[PDB]
Design a protein around this nucleic acid. Structure first.
Ligand SMILES: [Mg+2]
Ligand SMILES: [Mg+2]
Ligand SMILES: [Mg+2]
Ligand SMILES: [Mg+2]
Ligand SMILES: [Mg+2]
Ligand SMILES: [Mg+2]
Ligand SMILES: [Mg+2]
Ligand SMILES: [Mg+2]
Ligand SMILES: [Mg+2]
Ligand SMILES: [Mg+2]
Ligand SMILES: [Mg+2]
Ligand SMILES: [Mg+2]
Ligand SMILES: [Mg+2]
Ligand SMILES: [Mg+2]
Ligand SMILES: [Mg+2]
Ligand SMILES: [Mg+2]
Ligand SMILES: [Mg+2]
Ligand SMILES: [Mg+2]
Ligand SMILES: [Mg+2]
Ligand SMILES: [Mg+2]
Ligand SMILES: [Mg+2]
Ligand SMILES: [Mg+2]
Ligand SMILES: [Mg+2]
Ligand SMILES: [Mg+2]
Ligand SMILES: [Mg+2]
Ligand SMILES: [Mg+2]
Ligand SMILES: [Mg+2]
Ligand SMILES: [Mg+2]
Ligand SMILES: [Mg+2]
Ligand SMILES: [Mg+2]
Ligand SMILES: [Mg+2]
Ligand SMILES: [Mg+2]
Ligand SMILES: [Mg+2]
Ligand SMILES: [Mg+2]
Ligand SMILES: [Mg+2]
Ligand SMILES: [Mg+2]
Ligand SMILES: [Mg+2]
Ligand SMILES: [Mg+2]
Ligand SMILES: [Mg+2]
Ligand SMILES: [Mg+2]
Ligand SMILES: [Mg+2]
Ligand SMILES: [Mg+2]
Ligand SMILES: [Mg+2]
Ligand SMILES: [Mg+2]
Ligand SMILES: [Mg+2]
Ligand SMILES: [Mg+2]
Ligand SMILES: [Mg+2]
Ligand SMILES: [Mg+2]
Ligand SMILES: [Mg+2]
Ligand SMILES: [Mg+2]
Ligand SMILES: [Mg+2]
Ligand SMILES: [Mg+2]
Ligand SMILES: [Mg+2]
Ligand SMILES: [Mg+2]
Ligand SMILES: [Mg+2]
Ligand SMILES: [Mg+2]
Ligand SMILES: [Mg+2]
Ligand SMILES: [Mg+2]
Ligand SMILES: [Mg+2]
Ligand SMILES: [Mg+2]
Ligand SMILES: [Mg+2]
Ligand SMILES: [Mg+2]
Ligand SMILES: [Mg+2]
Ligand SMILES: [Mg+2]
Ligand SMILES: [Mg+2]
Ligand SMILES: [Mg+2]
Ligand SMILES: [Mg+2]
Ligand SMILES: [Mg+2]
Ligand SMILES: [Mg+2]
Ligand SMILES: [Mg+2]
Ligand SMILES: [Mg+2]
Ligand SMILES: [Mg+2]
Ligand SMILES: [Mg+2]
Ligand SMILES: [Mg+2]
Ligand SMILES: [Mg+2]
Ligand SMILES: [Mg+2]
Ligand SMILES: [Mg+2]
Ligand SMILES: [Mg+2]
Lengths: 46, 14, 63, 77, 102, 93
RNA sequence: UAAGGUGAUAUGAACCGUUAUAACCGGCGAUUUCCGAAUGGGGAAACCCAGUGUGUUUCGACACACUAUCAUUAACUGAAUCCAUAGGUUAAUGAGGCGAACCGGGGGAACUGAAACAUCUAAGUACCCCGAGGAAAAGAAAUCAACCGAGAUUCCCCCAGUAGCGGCGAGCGAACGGGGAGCAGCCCAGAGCCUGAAUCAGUGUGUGUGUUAGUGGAAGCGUCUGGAAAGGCGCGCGAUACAGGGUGACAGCCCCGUACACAAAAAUGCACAUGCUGUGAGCUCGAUGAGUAGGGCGGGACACGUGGUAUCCUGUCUGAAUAUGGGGGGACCAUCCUCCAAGGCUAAAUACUCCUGACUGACCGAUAGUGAACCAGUACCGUGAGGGAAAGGCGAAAAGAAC
RNA sequence: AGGACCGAACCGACUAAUGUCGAAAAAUUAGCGGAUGACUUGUGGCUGGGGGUGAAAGGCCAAUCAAACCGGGAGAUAGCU
RNA sequence: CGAAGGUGUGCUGUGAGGCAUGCUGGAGGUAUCAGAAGUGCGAAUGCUGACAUAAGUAACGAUAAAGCGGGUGAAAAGCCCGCUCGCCGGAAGACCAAGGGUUCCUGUCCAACGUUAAUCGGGGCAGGGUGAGUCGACCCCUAAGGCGAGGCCGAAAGGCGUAGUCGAUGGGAAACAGGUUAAUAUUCCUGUACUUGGUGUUACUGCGAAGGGGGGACGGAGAAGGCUAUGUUGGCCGGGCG
RNA sequence: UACGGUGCUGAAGCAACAAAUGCCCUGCUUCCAGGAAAAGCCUCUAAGCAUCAGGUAACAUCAAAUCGUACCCCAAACCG
């Protein structure tokens, strides 16, 4: 049984990383929402 | 929980 | 070593000491690492002294 | 965009109204064309994307007046 | 400033030691003072083997609220309140009730 | 030429352990906890200046801090750099 | 300002200080790694790789500075192509990104209601996007009124759920006029009569008033119970202070405070007189906003769904008069009245609270009140967007239990 | 030579039994099919919601699919329980 | 000289209730008359926490398998040592990438975790441990693709895209054997190498690029030959003669 | 002896045969479905400099930074 989560750090950062978020107007609104909510981890960047 | 399995199908009273 | 008797000094003797304050700092750090520094306060003291001398350098550097 | 360089006419929005009065969002676009105007003062051709009303405005005024207005607005032509 | 200082003779106003008299040993920022031989607690101290292990039931002073002590006049022989005034430009404490400087 | 104010920051401590003892014993290598920046050239210059010994080569590694659970909180110790400084021939001073 | 102090869990260690560079508090400075608009290029954020210049150099290395893009301005340069322009380089100035609501604008649902549903409603709402400010917007009649008059805009209470609009259904819903809050008017389209002529805008001085640390600040003892007194009992005192909080039980007089009276080296807000800087004063005469008003077609906004539909805005096609002229007065015409579009600026009353302080509550009190009284937007869940807890109380004192 | 043959790896999933609060939210055991190809597989990339992709089953699109998920409109509405 | 609360008792009212009081509790409560309501719970397959029931029941997760002696220990079926036995051996061995992130090694501890015990552990606590010119990344180069100065287009947001710049899963320099730690080793050590640059000295001379050309540089299948890894046997050497 | 291991010494260390799916081989043969790119690399010159610079070749010297490296990795350490 292959499951849905097949981790890959490169794909993770290219898909949801900080620079991926900053690339688009909508990704920068994700960061604004998570900053407003007070999220300790802003992105998947560690 | 977070996952509730679908109940088994009833006997087809058809 | 206060700020009065360091502001009376000059940019060169004051660059001398802060170099030798650093030296002192490195010796105290190695001594504390080996476990021979039974005076923990000397680290904070020489650190604040280095900060003081660098402050006075930034003042004497023009403004 | 579909904006007249002379008059500033741009697409507006309104309704398509059917006979049953069904309203549908629609756009009214300006009658835009790219046209080379002969600037005699500059002895050259300047291409502007203008509506037909903009062409009428350039006929009424001069192309020099309209180009001065564009420059005042800061629009590059 | 503070009305009760370190090397200051005080009398206890409240508690088991009411009326007892001693001198302050140190002032705690929590608003409590340690007075010599006043608030004696019996502490069951574990025999720490590292430095020295007398262990035993030691008799320590416990902090007492500064509210609960007043400085002793020794001229009127009773508890007295403290005001502040300026003599020679310097702020000094004086007693109320025979307003002499401390 | 690395400046002495930088050399006096490069070195942090000597690293005391069984492997460090064995290294100084039978390979003439002193083990140091150095700064994090701490290039090999900076470490060599600093050892040769401050310990006034003759350095052959510097091997460096970064030690990643351990995740420790102090009380009921998850903490992590800082990463630090370790330098194996091989002295040339004579001896430590 | 000070006799204590070296932030907390959190004790120790090593020390600092006690009469004025211990600490603490405030002003002004300094320092301020890396990432991030991130801006030298790149990048899987907190990393990788540079170029140029200056300086140092134990000679091979080091330090610092600069190097993004766009807009505007300027200088130089510069093609096809003669000039020229495009383009290029450099320099200066500005912007960029973030932020809770309020504001203006560009777009813009559907659920739902209509007991179905399509016109209609929801609703110009949610939401997306752009932009600004401390408020914004609007704003000095081509406005109303009704032969009487009012006199910019905005906001509140009426008018009035009225007149109307409306598958005349569900629903939507004014204005006129009145009472208030607050009021403020100007400028260009222009030439001559004066040449910092009132203002206005930025600077420097002062004065006053705050603000950012602070200072002083009254007056209670005895006895009973009690572990402890602030409680009871008795006798006193202060009060421009009996707000509040703490202290071993409930304290005006134990403490911190409170009323009250003072305080600022420095920075700073406001108010006022100013000293410079710049435009501009007032008078005469003139001018007085054209692809515009209006029209046709299609839409939208007006309470008003095209209706008999005025008015406004426009995508499209047209197109005046120009003050012996034109707009409006709810189809339209005549008369009369009233105003002067096609150029702009403008405070106040009005909106909101990310945030600061003080105060308040017939608000909650740990399943409540914020999700979060507690190391909570955490643990944990999810690829991600995102979702999202539980968990307070020993005692007065740790005296937290030697043996 | 060959979408040739038999048959491991590998990729599948025809039958049966077990399991069905499982060892497992799809398996195990015994057999079974393809196994040089229209094959299989690693890494990276692209296509997105009335959209994608589909040797087509309305299949698949993160254990979710006749319109994914998250947040919002939103306390939709509910003559029903 | 004992509040609220809790827990009994007695009395009392038509009822919701009330009153008194013992014990607990240890600091609050509140008449009366008015006033306001988050004002009364058994149900909503209600929500949260706690605790039952089934029940000391099913199960303890591959039917590869254990036995014994000694040790340690409070305690040994499970740990350590030993001797047997059994199981895998195209793996159930070894080395990596991905992913994880200290699980590695040592000492110590056994509460919780481990489907039992545990002295043991990938568990707790503390300490140690990762050494590179040559391995990899970084770096140079590019693919798919991404971004993209200007540009073109688009109500806005933005879309596409040129120059360019990124982007490996591909191309591009170089290290081997032996030894060594409790834990690293092509990194440490020993021995023996190699590569690419910089700077000098010397000698001889045309060098010079965002440009040209070559090269890099490439499919499937098949067959054979030559080899080697590797194995077998013999020889040799050491040991044995059961 | 910590009886876990530590230290010292150390013979022979050859041949034949067999043999890969590994290497020669990015070869060869054949087929059609006709099988990356760019750089490093070699070479050629342009402008430009030709004494210089630069290139080539010896020898010498210097440098080669930084980051990863433990451990699991058909697994009790990854996804379930
Ligand atoms: Mg992806
Ligand atoms: Mg080495
Ligand atoms: Mg390394
Ligand atoms: Mg950048
Ligand atoms: Mg810069
Ligand atoms: Mg940068
Ligand atoms: Mg780069
Ligand atoms: Mg901005
Ligand atoms: Mg509808
Ligand atoms: Mg309906
Ligand atoms: Mg209905
Ligand atoms: Mg502002
Ligand atoms: Mg305004
Ligand atoms: Mg009149
Ligand atoms: Mg009808
Ligand atoms: Mg005071
Ligand atoms: Mg007082
Ligand atoms: Mg009490
Ligand atoms: Mg005019
Ligand atoms: Mg019109
Ligand atoms: Mg009309
Ligand atoms: Mg018209
Ligand atoms: Mg009109
Ligand atoms: Mg009219
Ligand atoms: Mg006019
Ligand atoms: Mg206007
Ligand atoms: Mg709560
Ligand atoms: Mg409670
Ligand atoms: Mg076949
Ligand atoms: Mg198979
Ligand atoms: Mg299938
Ligand atoms: Mg089957
Ligand atoms: Mg077959
Ligand atoms: Mg077969
Ligand atoms: Mg893939
Ligand atoms: Mg079907
Ligand atoms: Mg699925
Ligand atoms: Mg649908
Ligand atoms: Mg939803
Ligand atoms: Mg709604
Ligand atoms: Mg509902
Ligand atoms: Mg109460
Ligand atoms: Mg009892
Ligand atoms: Mg209720
Ligand atoms: Mg009921
Ligand atoms: Mg219930
Ligand atoms: Mg149960
Ligand atoms: Mg039971
Ligand atoms: Mg049973
Ligand atoms: Mg049974
Ligand atoms: Mg059983
Ligand atoms: Mg079993
Ligand atoms: Mg088992
Ligand atoms: Mg045994
Ligand atoms: Mg067993
Ligand atoms: Mg651990
Ligand atoms: Mg282990
Ligand atoms: Mg262990
Ligand atoms: Mg036990
Ligand atoms: Mg157990
Ligand atoms: Mg462990
Ligand atoms: Mg490409
Ligand atoms: Mg693009
Ligand atoms: Mg652009
Ligand atoms: Mg590249
Ligand atoms: Mg690669
Ligand atoms: Mg890369
Ligand atoms: Mg190992
Ligand atoms: Mg050329
Ligand atoms: Mg061989
Ligand atoms: Mg061999
Ligand atoms: Mg043999
Ligand atoms: Mg023999
Ligand atoms: Mg094969
Ligand atoms: Mg030369
Ligand atoms: Mg040579
Ligand atoms: Mg390893
Ligand atoms: Mg291992």
């Amino acid at each position: 049984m292959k499951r849905t989560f097949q981790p890959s750090v490169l794909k993770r950062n290219r898909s949801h990383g900080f620079r991926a978020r900053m690339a688009t107007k909508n990704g920068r609104q994700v960061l604004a929402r998570r900053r407003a909510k007070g999220r300790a981890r802003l992105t998947v960047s560690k | 929980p977070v996952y509730i399995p679908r109940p088994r199908p009833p006997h087809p009273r058809l | 070593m206060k700020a009065k008797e360091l502001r009376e000094k000059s940019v060169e003797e004051l660059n001398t000491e802060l170099l030798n304050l650093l030296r002192e700092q490195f010796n105290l750090r190695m001594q504390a690492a080996s476990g021979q520094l039974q005076q923990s306060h000397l680290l904070k003291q020489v650190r604040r002294d280095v900060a003081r001398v660098k402050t006075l350098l930034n003042e004497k550097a023009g403004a | 965009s579909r904006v007249c360089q002379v008059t500033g006419k741009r697409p507006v929005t309104g309704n398509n109204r059917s006979h049953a009065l069904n309203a549908t969002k629609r756009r009214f676009l300006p009658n835009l064309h790219s046209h080379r105007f002969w600037v005699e003062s500059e002895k050259r051709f300047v291409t502007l994307r203008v509506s037909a009303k903009g062409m009428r405005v350039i006929d009424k005024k001069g192309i020099d007046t309209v180009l001065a207005e564009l420059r005042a607005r800061g629009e590059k032509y | 400033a503070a009305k009760i200082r370190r090397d200051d003779e005080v009398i206890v106003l409240t508690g088991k030691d009411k009326g007892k008299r001693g001198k302050v040993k140190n002032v705690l920022s929590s608003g409590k003072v340690i007075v010599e031989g006043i608030n004696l607690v019996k502490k069951h101290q574990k025999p720490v083997p590292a430095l020295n292990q007398p262990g035993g039931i030691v008799e320590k002073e416990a902090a007492i609220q500064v509210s609960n002590v007043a400085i002793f006049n020794a001229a009127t022989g009773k508890a007295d309140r403290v005001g502040f005034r300026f003599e020679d430009g310097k702020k000094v404490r004086f007693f109320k009730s025979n307003s002499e400087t401390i | 030429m690395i400046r002495e104010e930088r050399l006096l920051k490069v070195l942090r401590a000597p690293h005391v352990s069984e492997k460090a003892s064995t290294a100084m014993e039978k390979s003439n290598t002193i083990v140091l906890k150095v700064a994090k920046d701490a290039t090999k050239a900076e470490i060599k210059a600093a050892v040769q200046k401050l310990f006034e010994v003759e350095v052959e080569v510097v091997n460096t590694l970064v030690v990643k801090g351990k995740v420790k659970r102090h009380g009921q909180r998850i903490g992590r110790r800082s990463d630090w750099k370790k330098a194996y400084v091989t002295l040339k021939e004579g001896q430590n001073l």
